[PDB]
Each structure stands twice: as C-alpha cells, then as structure tokens.
Amino acid sequence: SKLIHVPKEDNSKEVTLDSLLEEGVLDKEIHKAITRMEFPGLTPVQQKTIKPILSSEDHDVIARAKTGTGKTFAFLIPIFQHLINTKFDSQYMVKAVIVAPTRDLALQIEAEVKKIHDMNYGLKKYACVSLVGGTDFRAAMNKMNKLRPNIVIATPGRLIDVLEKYSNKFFRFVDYKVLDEADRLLEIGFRDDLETISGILNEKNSKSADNIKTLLFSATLDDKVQKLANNIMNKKECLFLDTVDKNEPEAHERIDQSVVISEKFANSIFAAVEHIKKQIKERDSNYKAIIFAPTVKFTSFLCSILKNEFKKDLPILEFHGKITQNKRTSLVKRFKKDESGILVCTDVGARGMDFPNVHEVLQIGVPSELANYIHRIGRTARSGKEGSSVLFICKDELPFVRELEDAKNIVIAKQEKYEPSEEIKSEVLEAVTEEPEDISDIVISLISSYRSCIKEYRFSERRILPEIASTYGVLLNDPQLKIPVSRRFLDKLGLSRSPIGKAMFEIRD
RNA sequence: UUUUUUUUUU
Numbered sequence A: 001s002k003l004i005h006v007p008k009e010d011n012s013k014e015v016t017l018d019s020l021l022e023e024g025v026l027d028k029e030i031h032k033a034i035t036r037m038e039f040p041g042l043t044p045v046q047q048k049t050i051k052p053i054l055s056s057e058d059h060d061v062i063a064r065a066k067t068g069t070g071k072t073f074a075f076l077i078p079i080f081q082h083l084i085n086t087k088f089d090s091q092y093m094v095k096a097v098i099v100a101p102t103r104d105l106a107l108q109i110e111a112e113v114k115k116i117h118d119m120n121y122g123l124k125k126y127a128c129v130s131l132v133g134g135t136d137f138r139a140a141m142n143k144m145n146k147l148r149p150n151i152v153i154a155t156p157g158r159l160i161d162v163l164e165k166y167s168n169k170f171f172r173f174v175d176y177k178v179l180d181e182a183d184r185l186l187e188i189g190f191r192d193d194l195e196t197i198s199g200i201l202n203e204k205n206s207k208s209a210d211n212i213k214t215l216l217f218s219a220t221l222d223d224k225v226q227k228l229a230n231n232i233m234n235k236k237e238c239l240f241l242d243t244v245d246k247n248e249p250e251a252h253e254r255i256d257q258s259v260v261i262s263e264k265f266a267n268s269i270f271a272a273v274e275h276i277k278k279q280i281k282e283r284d285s286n287y288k289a290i291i292f293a294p295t296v297k298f299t300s301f302l303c304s305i306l307k308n309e310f311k312k313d314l315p316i317l318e319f320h321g322k323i324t325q326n327k328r329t330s331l332v333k334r335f336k337k338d339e340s341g342i343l344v345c346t347d348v349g350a351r352g353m354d355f356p357n358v359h360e361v362l363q364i365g366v367p368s369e370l371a372n373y374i375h376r377i378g379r380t381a382r383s384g385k386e387g388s389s390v391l392f393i394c395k396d397e398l399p400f401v402r403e404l405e406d407a408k409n410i411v412i413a414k415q416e417k418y419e420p421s422e423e424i425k426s427e428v429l430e431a432v433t434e435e436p437e438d439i440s441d442i443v444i445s446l447i448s449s450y451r452s453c454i455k456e457y458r459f460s461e462r463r464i465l466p467e468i469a470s471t472y473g474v475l476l477n478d479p480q481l482k483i484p485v486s487r488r489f490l491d492k493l494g495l496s497r498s499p500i501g502k503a504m505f506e507i508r509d
Numbered sequence B: 001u002u003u004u005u006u007u008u009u010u
C-alpha cells in the first residue's frame, strides 16, 4: 500500500501540550497528567506523532526516533485520548493492544501507563493490564475480569495464549495495535507470532477486518520494514513519521563511542575488568554501568568475575532470560532507582529498557544482531543526559565494526589496542571457581552464538571460531589445550571433516 | 554438550 514519507524538518513550529489542548486534539484530563510530570516540553517524536496518530484519516503510522527520546509517551498519549474520545462506547473492552519483544519492556510500558494514572486519578477508569510470560495466568485473567481494561500490554507468546481462549470476551473492539521495537517483532521468530496476533484481532473485530490501525515504533527502521509489516497493516495509507534524517546514523550523537581491540576474545574480559576498576577509582564509586554479553552462560560467568572484583565497591546485578521472572522484575526496579551499580545482561535488556542516568554501556563481544549495537548503547544518554560506550572486541571480530560503517553508517572514532598484563590475568583467573566442565559449557555456548552471526557480520569462520574456542584454554591457563568432546558431538556440529573442527576440539572419548 | 528473546502458573 501507499507509504507517505514525512522526513525531518528543521524550521517547523514547536508543538506543545498547551497548543494541543486549545487546538482540540488533547482533552483537559490527559493534558493535566503530562503537564504534572514537568517535562521542559514535548520531544521531537512526541510533537510529530500525537496529532497524526489521532487524526481521523484512515492511516497506519510508522515512526522512527532515537534511543531515549520518549517514543513511549509518543504512543501512550494518543491512546489515552482515543479512550477519552470514545469513553461511552464499549467501555469494558480492550481498545489498545501494545506488544513488545521482552517481558520487562512490557512491564515497563505498563509502569508508564501507571505513572499517567498517578498524575491524574481521573484517568484510572481507563484501566491497563499486562499479559506476559513468567506470571500467574489465572491471576492476570482475574485482573482482566475485575478491571476490564481498555489497554493491554503484552509479549507475543502469552498474548497468543490468551487470545486463543478469550479473544471474544475482551478483544472484539480493539482500535489500535502498537508494535514497540517494531523491527525486532518483525524478524524471523516474532513475525509469525505477530501475524497470528494480527489475524485473530482482525477476524474477531465487530466492525470490520480492517478496523484496527497499526503503530510501528523503533530507533531502527526503514522502508524495508514496511514490506515486512505488509500482512499486519490494514489501511490504504501509511504515514512514515521520521525524526532522524534519511542518511543520518541511527545511533544517538551525544553518546561518546569507543572500541577497544584485543588480540584474543578472552582478553576482552580483562580489558573490561581493568576499565571498570579505573572508573570506580576515578568516580569514587559513583558509577552506573550496563555491561552486555553474548550468552546466558557467559553472562553468568561474567557476573562471578565482576562480583569477585567489584562487589565491595558496587552492586553487581545478573539479568537474563534464565533469571526467574520475579527477580527480573525486582532487579529492574532496583537498577532503575539506584545511583550506581553494574547490570550484567544479555540482549534481553538491549531494547527499550529505561534505566535513568546510566554513565556507560560496555560490550564484551558483538550483539545478537547488527541493529542492537545501536539499542545497547542507547541504554545511556537518555532524555538530554550524557553517556559513553566502549565496545570490547578481538581482532577477529573487526568485520563487525566495518559492517557498522557499511550497513548503518556508524563510524566509531575512538579506537585503541589492548594487551593484558600477567597480573590481571592472575587476579581474574585465580578467583574463578568454575570447573573445567562448566568452562566448556560456557565456551561452547559462545561458539554457537558466534556461529549464528558469521554471515550477518561477514566473519571468517576459519579465524573467528577457533579464536572463540581458544577461550577455553586461556581461562584454564593452558593456551594449547583444546576442548574435550566426542566424535558424536563433533558430527552434530557438522565439522567432523572440517580442519576448523580439528583446531577447536580434542576428542577425549 | 539448548546461540538472544518469545505462551505452557491455561
């Protein structure tokens, strides 16, 4: 269908809460709730999207704005207005369905909706319920029945679960569906779930199959995503509201980026330790940082190291998809509040999470996808604030850095080499309590991880994979020792006839 | 010797 570009204008008139009120777009009660938050003004994306989203023109909306610039209220504000506009119609029915790629981002959006509620008790009648995995199903359904929300916030899995059983009871009058982190929800693995979600909401709608308007929001999207959303976009028009220039890099400009290039992968562990050590001394422990790692198992290992080194200076929080949902929520609650600390996580916390006044984002390794470089570093430098990022990689991961220039126009200025001293190696490795069996599982998880992104990051399989596997030897402090495996295991990997496989593993069967 | 997420507490 037709895609109307609305690119960035640098001389247009500043839209405001006051102006939107007097103009007739915003009602007094929603103006009241947002004014009480005391924001200097509305953000560029907020100014650009609120009126169009509410416009009675029959169109979908795509919107791109940078990490930290308030996309959340860019959609929650217009949604509330629509609930006010139609307050007497279908008042016990879900009118807006917000979907997100992680549970913690679903729970964050709900939280923001609750913040709108607490700034105006009048808006509480427009109830909100979150349907996400890891929580009691029955209890959430009790909440749907008792509150009869007009807004649902969800992750795909649990939403499908609920839709297949209660789409008739709550979901026949949905008017808006929002895909936050849209580009991710349309990658393989979520796209089919979204298409099921969209298909059900469309079939079950009481007005028509094309009633629902669709809102796509992300810091990383182009026209390419309008093709992928094709099967879930009903309307004949689609506004593309852009606050970033066509060629301007998507990364937030205020973030001071740098990359530290080690000779081995494992060396990035020592680089990161020395860095955090230097920040704690220099900032007198006034340091809030997020450190990303490629896998659950390596993340867990990384926490052990950082605990041993830094627990006396700072709290170290472990955040990934194998942390139970109760703890995920509570530790997100803490790191939102805390002035200082290190959150160690996978890409579960790459997108959307809003942790105020993070000083630095650190990365050991590459992200799970190219776009996520941008989102990772976007956890810092939010709402006007400053921030730095350091990417810790090895020589063999440099093609990733090049691909950032080629595919995304991201040119990291600050680069430098790193080589660990024997003392840091001793300090870190002697504190490690993991058995060689545990160390194998961790390195093996890294081989798989790096194997997945070879084509995407243009890696040399013959160089990159032996370097990751040699991490096993470095951590046990015997560089020429190889990972003990069976022939049956080597055949699952499809490397029994590969020289690359001879370099990585030793058969100890 | 489940690479990041994502129902199965329906």
Ligand SMILES: Nc1ncnc2c1ncn2[C@@H]1O[C@H](COP(=O)(O)OP(=O)(O)NP(=O)(O)O)[C@@H](O)[C@H]1O
Pocket: A039, A040, A041, A042, A043, A046, A065, A066, A067, A068, A069, A070, A071, A072, A073, A218, A219, A351, A352, A353, A354, A378, A382, A383
């Ligand atoms: N108009 C505003 N002025 C100043 N701060 C704001 C405004 N709107 C929202 N914020 C705050 O900005 C922070 C980030 O907002 P958020 O909606 O998470 O940005 P975002 O575009 O969704 N970032 P991401 O999803 O990570 O790309 C939140 O803590 C809000 O409280």
Ligand SMILES: [Mg+2]
Pocket: A071, A072, A180, A352
């Ligand atoms: Mg956001």
